[PDB]
Symmetry: C2
Subunit: 79 residues, 2 copies
C-alpha cells in the first residue's frame, strides 16, 4: 500500500545488505564496502541503521525482503 | 520472472540512487554519499556502474524503477 518513501526504500536496501553479511555470503572486501556504503546511505536519506527495524515496522514490507519483492516483479516491454 | 540475482538487485538500487541525483532531489551532501556508496556497491557485487544499463537490459525490470517495484508490494503480517 506504501508508495515507497525514501526512508522505506533505503530501509529495504540496507536490510538486504545486512542480510548478505548476516549469512556471510559476500566476500570480506564486499562486506566492508557495504559497511561504509551503509553509513553513506544512512547519511544520504537522513536515518540511522538500527532505525531500519522501525521503518520496516511501520511500513508494510514486513515479512518480506528486498529481493523477494523484486522477485514478484515482472515487466517485459518488448518493443 | 527473475529471482532477483545479486547484480540485478544492485542494478535497481544504484539506478534508483542515480535517479535521485538525476532529478537533483537529494541534498549535495547526500548526493556525494551516494557516489562513494555506489563505488562500494559496485565493488561489493563485482560490477561497474554503467553496467547497470546492461543488467537492467537483460533482466526484466525494464520500464520500471526500484520504488515502483516496491510500490506494487503489500504485506501486512498482522499477528
Amino acid at each position: 500500500m506504501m508508495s515507497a518513501s525514501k526512508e522505506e526504500i533505503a530501509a529495504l536496501i540496507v536490510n538486504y545488505f545486512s542480510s548478505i553479511v548476516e549469512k556471510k555470503e559476500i566476500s570480506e572486501d564486499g562486506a566492508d564496502s557495504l559497511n561504509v556504503a551503509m553509513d553513506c546511505i544512512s547519511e544520504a536519506f537522513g536515518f540511522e541503521r538500527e532505525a531500519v527495524s522501525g521503518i520496516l515496522g511501520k511500513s508494510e514490507f514486513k515479512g518480506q525482503h528486498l529481493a523477494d519483492i523484486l522477485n514478484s516483479a515482472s515487466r517485459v516491454p518488448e518493443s
